[PDB]
Design a protein around this ligand. Structure first.
Ligand SMILES: Cc1oc(-c2ccccc2)nc1CCCc1ccc(C[C@@H](C(=O)O)n2nccn2)cc1
Ligand SMILES: Cc1oc(-c2ccccc2)nc1CCCc1ccc(C[C@@H](C(=O)O)n2nccn2)cc1
Lengths: 255, 254
């Protein structure tokens, strides 16, 4: 029933709002919108970073400090996604090991997805949107550290061309979470059952919310390939970094 | 409109039949014992391979894959030209689309000739076991296994040739290929192709919920298979310096 699908869609939207502080709506307004109330601090070079470190406080080489800050934010994002996942109908009733498996393999795909919401072609909103770090400044960090954000920007530019909103993304990230092809899964059936229902909800959502955008559903699904490729090359970029940035309690938090 | 999309489905099925002489319908008939077709000779060890070679082994098998891949590129190229709007695209983009599409198509269609236990070879005259392929010398016993693992999952979708004709068309017309000059005419064609796939799947598989979505997600599997495979070919290039990729395949890889 369309009624049940639209019910599922609104439920996911409501939970997404409750779980993620900085939404796309709020981030687009900050980046370029009729919001001129407050203004992010711009970080475009080394001096502005130092300047940004004193005013806004972050709760040793510059390129390393930035890397570690990304790790801290990554860890915060995991917990927000984890909370969101619990609201997806059926999710908590899955085998406990499968829940952990889906989250483990899914978080990065979602992190890169939602990061696009905070990006344009020229930079990324940082620290709850109190800041703005430029694409150029990130490009110039060093020999290993100057490459990890560029692929994310490249994906975002393309992904953002789809012009999805929060209500669209809520269902999309749920589809991502309930993938039955994650390795080590024990009971693939109810996962695929839920994803099929989420997929139906996403399709109707896109058809109602973007009636003039032909085949948007298909094109969104095709992006999942871009995401998986980006996750894979990221872990690959981290293995090389591990052989440069060669605290024991900190390395536990960031395993 | 329904009618226009159905007419597109038929045209692509028609050209598929004309371009690919070993179809999935035929492959299944050979693999399951149907009387429409004849049973293959089975290659499972060195001696059966020796007995089979009427109509180094690891190398010979590897070259057999090369010739078959080259033959496949040719058939895919013939098929592509039938895709409405494809030949009217910038020539450089035609080359680019073929360059990045062929292998994804090859591994897709190779599943049609596979079951959990092996693969049809030499136009269905032969059947080479999965196990025999693993037993090959260290740099050659690796390349087939992930194709099998893909095939076992891809085959679970139960697509037939008329489904595959459209899906492969969708693959060729990907606007996201590296170095494309005019993305928009390509994406306009793929959009019409995707609509045609969607309707085909829902008419041909009415009981199969979100098959369209599940099929598209398989393109992720394909792209990883290509990447894995390239890395594996680089190993072989460095070990066997007396050996040579086919020029057509050399040109494609880059
Ligand atoms: C580029 C950037 O810099 C800051 C930032 C920098 C200094 C202070 C506060 C925030 N926030 C951002 C936004 C990017 C957020 C972000 C979140 C997660 C990840 C993946 C994360 C991971 O591997 O899980 N990672 N840690 C290090 C490198 N990659 C990468 C990037
Ligand atoms: C396993 C097998 O053996 C024979 C065969 C063996 C001896 C004589 C004739 C055919 N045909 C097959 C099935 C073809 C499977 C197949 C087809 C294409 C490709 C890709 C092809 C490529 O990379 O273009 N390749 N060449 C070498 C390794 N990979 C990889 C594998």
């Amino acid at each position: 029933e369309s009624a049940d699908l639209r019910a599922l869609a609104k439920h996911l939207y409501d939970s997404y709002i409750k779980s993620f502080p900085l939404t796309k709506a709020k981030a687009r307004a900050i980046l370029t919108g009729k919001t001129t109330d407050k203004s992010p601090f711009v970080i475009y070079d080394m001096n502005s970073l130092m300047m940004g470190e004193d005013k806004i406080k972050f709760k040793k080489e510059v390129a390393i400090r930035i890397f570690q800050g990304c790790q801290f934010r990554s860890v915060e994002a995991v917990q927000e996604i984890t909370e969101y996942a619990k609201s997806i109908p059926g999710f908590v009733n899955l085998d406990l090991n499968d829940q952990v498996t889906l989250l483990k393999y899914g978080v990065h795909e979602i992190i890169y997805t939602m990061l696009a919401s905070l990006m344009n072609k020229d930079g990324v909103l940082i620290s709850e949107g109190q800041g703005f770090m430029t694409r150029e400044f990130l490009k110039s960090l060093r020999k290993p550290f100057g490459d990890f954000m560029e692929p994310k920007f490249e994906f975002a530019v393309k992904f953002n061309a789809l012009e999805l909103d929060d209500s669209d993304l809520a269902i999309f990230i749920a589809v991502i979470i309930l993938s039955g092809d994650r390795p080590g899964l024990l009971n693939v059936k109810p996962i695929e059952d839920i994803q099929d229902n989420l997929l139906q909800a996403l399709e109707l959502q896109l058809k109602l919310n973007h009636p003039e955008s032909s085949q948007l559903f298909a094109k969104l699904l095709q992006k999942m390939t871009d995401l998986r490729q980006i996750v894979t090359e990221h872990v690959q970029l981290l293995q090389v970094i591990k052989k440069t940035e060669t605290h024991p309690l900190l390395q536990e938090i960031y395993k």
